[PDB]
Amino acid sequence: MAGLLRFLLSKGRALYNWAKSHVGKVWEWLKSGATYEQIKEWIENALGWR
């Protein structure tokens, strides 16, 4: 989990904040098996839309 958080932080701060706010989302993506890149992509796209 720590590695996942570090990766998100290195890519962006917004991604890190999102993961912290909703740990559930982090768990959901891990269960799915998606990729770290794809997951931040979705997150950043939603952020821009909002």
Domain parsing of the chain, residue ranges: 2-50
Helices 36-49 + 13-21 axis angle, to 10: 90
CB 16 within 8 A of CB 9: yes
**Sign, Cα dihedral of 47, 15, 42, 29:** negative
Contacts of 14 (CB under 8 A, 6+ apart): 43, 44, 47
- Distance between CA atoms of residues 24 and 37, nearest Å: 18
Contacts of 23 (CB under 8 A, 6+ apart): none
Cβ neighbourhood burial of 21 (10 Å; 0-12, 13-18, 19+): exposed
CA angle (48, 11, 28) in 5-degree steps: 75
DSSP state of 35: -
